[PDB]
Each structure stands twice: as structure tokens, then as C-alpha cells.
């Protein structure tokens, strides 16, 4: 038996869960009979990028229904989607492309986290969950209720939680501190480098094997850049419920992962409106999503020489904007150390 905590224990098995990942898959329409879990490849996933990047340019350059038609049907050649006998949904807009971008982005997490439970070593004398995290390469322990850390984190997720996300409550279940192998020394170049803040990131609880065993990283160049509002980057948010919608928690599955990492964000390209850029301009660092509402910068705290906007929501003067909340994005992943994981548990209103 496993001498690991017990919440370390119950976390390994959330994110290592084979029939979440399967469930996760459903979601999103794909045919488990024609494509299971085992079937994935991250050269398909790639391909399948690919074929959604040209359907990006048939959309932008009013190509004809009946040329987009033969795209959208190549899609469905590579990832197979449950339809039967039926013709499938016509991939013909920007958000039909989005929204098998973010597919194709959980496909990529969920092969890492399916690669890592078929590979390695089997022992049966060994715990399973010993053996699985170990496969992650990362540092989780528990942080102490009681301490000044837990503290900070817990009034942050207080303050943070945005009245337009009032469909649920969250409750902090556990706060664990992370340490990914080698990532210190990769954020090196970036650790003095000015504006770091403490930034919330939501993810799918079948997505955190592949976060904590490789990092955040960025969409492939053969992903469509017009799918991602900032474009390719690593989106962060200093309101806990903006990161937590992302959680894609339910009534059916109400406990939730969310992240805390150290993003050195430098000199902000401050955008009010989508910018789907390759590249930042000269001199910046990292894009900031003007939002509405933003914490109260006077309400800022330090945890370790990083910044918590851990601030009540308060208006930020900033007219015509596409965002009611703020969002941060980097273009390296170095420029992201992550700190904190949290176990969320979702208590829906509705
Ligand atoms: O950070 C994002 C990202 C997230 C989102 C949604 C989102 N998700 N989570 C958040 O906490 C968040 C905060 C502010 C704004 C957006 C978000 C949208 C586009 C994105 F490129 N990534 C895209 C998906 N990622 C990948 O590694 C893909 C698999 C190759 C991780 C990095």
C-alpha cells in the first residue's frame, strides 16, 4: 500500500481515471467503436489540426459550402465522430473551427495521460497510484490547512469569484504545492523579470496528467491561430471563477482541478479586441485581455516576491472591450512556473 497522502492518493486517480478520459471524449461527439482511447496518436491529432487550419482558410476566403464541404469531411476522416448512417455537421464557421480546436487540444492531453498509464513499468508488488506518480515527475505535497499559504490561496478564491458565475459556489477541498521536475531551472531567464503574478488556470481534470508531466505548453504551428482569441499562447485569468468555467465541471461531476502558476508577464501588450498574432511586438513579453472588472490593484498582495491580485472585483475604467475579466497570455513556456494545484469542489445553485 501507498505511503502518500491520502488527497495526493485521491488526485492520482482523478487525473489517471481511464473512463473520464472516455467520458471526456463523448463530450465532444467522437466515436469511440471507430476511434478508442488506445487509437490516439499525436500525429492524427496533428493531421487533424492541419485539415482544421485549411478549413480556416476556406472560411476567411468565402470559399464556396460545396468546397468546404470536402474539408469538413476530411476532418471527420481523421478524428471519426459519432453520427452513424447520418450525414455529420457541416464545419463551415469560425466557431465550428474553434470548437474542434479545443477538441484537438484535449485529445493531445488526454494521449499524453494515456501513453503515460500504458508505458513504463508494470509491477505488481508496487501501489498503482505510487507507480502512476511517479510517471508525472512532479513534487505534490500537501499544504497545511493552517498556514499563512492556504490562507492567501483560500482569500483569493473568496475574493475572486465573479458575480456573472454565480451558477455555482466553489469550495477548496485541497491546496497542493507543485514542483515539476526541471521547471525552476527552465524559468531562470524569467525569474527576475518584472510584473510576475500568481495567475489562475482551469483545465479538465483529464488534462492535468499531461500539465503536470509536461508543462502548460502551446497549440502545435499546425493548429489554427484563428481559433485561439490571443492566439497560441498559455491563458491566464486573476479571477478564480473566470479559470474555474474551464473546469467543465457538472451536477453529474462536481469536483474540479484548477492551477496556480507564476507567470513572468514583463511588458504587457494590452488588447481590448481578438488579436490572433504568431508573434508579440518588439519589446513585450506577454498579451493583456482588458476586462471590465479587475481586482483591486490596492488589495495586492506578495506570496514569495510574486503578486496576488487577490483583490475584490472593482471596475477598471476601461470602455469597449470584448471581456467582462481580465486574461493574461505567453508565447514561451518557460515564462509559466507552476506553484499551486487545487481540488475544487463545485456547489451548483441551479
Ligand atoms: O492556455 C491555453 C488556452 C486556454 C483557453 C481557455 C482558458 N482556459 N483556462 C483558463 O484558465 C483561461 C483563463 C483565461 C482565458 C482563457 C482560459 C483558450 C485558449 C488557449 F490557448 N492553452 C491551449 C491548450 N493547451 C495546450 O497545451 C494544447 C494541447 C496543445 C494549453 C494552453
Same mark, same amino acid.
Given at each position: 500500500?501507498?505511503?502518500?497522502?491520502?488527497?495526493?492518493?485521491?488526485?492520482?486517480?482523478?487525473?489517471?481515471?481511464?473512463?473520464?478520459?472516455?467520458?471526456?471524449?463523448?463530450?465532444?461527439?467522437?466515436?469511440?467503436?471507430?476511434?478508442?482511447?488506445?487509437?490516439?496518436?499525436?500525429?492524427?491529432?496533428?493531421?487533424?489540426?492541419?485539415?482544421?487550419? =485549411? *478549413?480556416?482558410?476556406?472560411?476567411?476566403? @468565402?470559399? #464556396? +459550402?460545396?468546397?468546404?464541404? /470536402?474539408?469538413?469531411?476530411?476532418? $471527420?476522416?481523421?478524428?471519426?465522430?459519432?453520427?452513424?448512417?447520418?450525414?455529420?455537421?457541416?464545419?463551415?464557421?469560425?466557431?465550428?473551427?474553434?470548437?474542434?480546436?479545443?477538441?484537438?487540444?484535449?485529445?493531445?492531453?488526454? =494521449? *499524453?495521460?494515456?501513453?503515460?498509464?500504458? @508505458?513504463? #513499468? +508494470?509491477?505488481?508488488?508496487? /501501489?498503482?497510484?505510487?507507480?502512476? $506518480?511517479?510517471?508525472?515527475?512532479?513534487?505534490?505535497?500537501?499544504?497545511?490547512?493552517?498556514?499563512?499559504?492556504?490562507?492567501?490561496?483560500?482569500?483569493?478564491?473568496?475574493?475572486?469569484?465573479?458575480?456573472?458565475?454565480?451558477?455555482?459556489?466553489?469550495?477548496?477541498?485541497?491546496?497542493?504545492?507543485?514542483?515539476?521536475?526541471?521547471?525552476?531551472?527552465?524559468?531562470?531567464?524569467?525569474?527576475?523579470?518584472?510584473?510576475?503574478?500568481?495567475?489562475?488556470?482551469?483545465?479538465?481534470?483529464?488534462?492535468?496528467?499531461?500539465?503536470?508531466?509536461?508543462?502548460?505548453?502551446?497549440?502545435?504551428?499546425?493548429?489554427?491561430?484563428?481559433?485561439?482569441?490571443?492566439?497560441?499562447?498559455?491563458?491566464?485569468?486573476?479571477?478564480?471563477?473566470?479559470?474555474?468555467?474551464?473546469?467543465?465541471?457538472?451536477?453529474?461531476?462536481?469536483?474540479?482541478?484548477?492551477?496556480?502558476?507564476?507567470?513572468?508577464?514583463?511588458?504587457?501588450?494590452?488588447?481590448?479586441?481578438?488579436?490572433?498574432?504568431?508573434?508579440?511586438?518588439?519589446?513585450?513579453?506577454?498579451?493583456?485581455?482588458?476586462?471590465?472588472?479587475?481586482?483591486?490593484?490596492?488589495?495586492?498582495?506578495?506570496?514569495?516576491?510574486?503578486?496576488?491580485?487577490?483583490?475584490?472585483?472593482?471596475?477598471?475604467?476601461?470602455?469597449?472591450?470584448?471581456?467582462?475579466?481580465?486574461?493574461?497570455?505567453?508565447?514561451?513556456?518557460?515564462?509559466?512556473?507552476?506553484?499551486?494545484?487545487?481540488?475544487?469542489?463545485?456547489?451548483?445553485?441551479?
Amino acid at each position: 500500500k501507498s505511503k502518500l497522502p491520502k488527497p495526493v492518493q485521491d488526485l492520482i486517480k482523478m487525473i489517471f481515471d481511464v473512463e473520464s478520459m472516455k467520458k471526456a471524449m463523448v463530450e465532444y461527439e467522437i466515436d469511440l467503436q471507430k476511434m478508442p482511447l488506445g487509437k490516439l496518436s499525436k500525429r492524427q491529432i496533428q493531421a487533424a489540426y492541419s485539415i482544421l487550419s =485549411e *478549413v480556416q482558410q476556406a472560411v476567411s476566403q @468565402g470559399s #464556396s +459550402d460545396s468546397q468546404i464541404l /470536402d474539408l469538413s469531411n476530411r476532418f $471527420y476522416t481523421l478524428i471519426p465522430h459519432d453520427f452513424g448512417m447520418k450525414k455529420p455537421p457541416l464545419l463551415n464557421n469560425a466557431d465550428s473551427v474553434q470548437a474542434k480546436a479545443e477538441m484537438l487540444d484535449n485529445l493531445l492531453d488526454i =494521449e *499524453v495521460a494515456y501513453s503515460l498509464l500504458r @508505458g513504463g #513499468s +508494470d509491477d505488481s508488488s508496487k /501501489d498503482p497510484i505510487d507507480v502512476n $506518480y511517479e510517471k508525472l515527475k512532479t513534487d505534490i505535497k500537501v499544504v497545511d490547512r493552517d498556514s499563512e499559504e492556504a490562507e492567501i490561496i483560500r482569500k483569493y478564491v473568496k475574493n475572486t469569484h465573479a458575480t456573472t458565475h454565480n451558477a455555482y459556489d466553489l469550495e477548496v477541498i485541497d491546496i497542493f504545492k507543485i514542483e515539476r521536475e526541471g521547471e525552476c531551472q527552465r524559468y531562470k531567464p524569467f525569474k527576475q523579470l518584472h510584473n510576475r503574478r500568481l495567475l489562475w488556470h482551469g483545465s479538465r481534470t483529464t488534462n492535468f496528467a499531461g500539465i503536470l508531466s509536461q508543462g502548460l505548453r502551446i497549440a502545435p504551428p499546425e493548429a489554427p491561430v484563428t481559433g485561439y482569441m490571443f492566439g497560441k499562447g498559455i491563458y491566464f485569468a486573476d479571477m478564480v471563477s473566470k479559470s474555474a468555467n474551464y473546469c467543465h465541471t457538472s451536477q453529474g461531476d462536481p469536483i474540479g482541478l484548477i492551477l496556480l502558476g507564476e507567470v513572468a508577464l514583463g511588458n504587457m501588450y494590452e488588447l481590448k479586441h481578438a488579436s490572433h498574432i504568431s508573434k508579440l511586438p518588439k519589446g513585450k513579453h506577454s498579451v493583456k485581455g482588458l476586462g471590465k472588472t479587475t481586482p483591486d490593484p490596492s488589495a495586492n498582495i506578495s506570496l514569495d516576491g510574486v503578486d496576488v491580485p487577490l483583490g475584490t472585483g472593482i471596475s477598471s475604467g476601461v470602455n469597449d472591450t470584448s471581456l467582462l475579466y481580465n486574461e493574461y497570455i505567453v508565447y514561451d513556456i518557460a515564462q509559466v512556473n507552476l506553484k499551486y494545484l487545487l481540488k475544487l469542489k463545485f456547489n451548483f445553485k441551479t
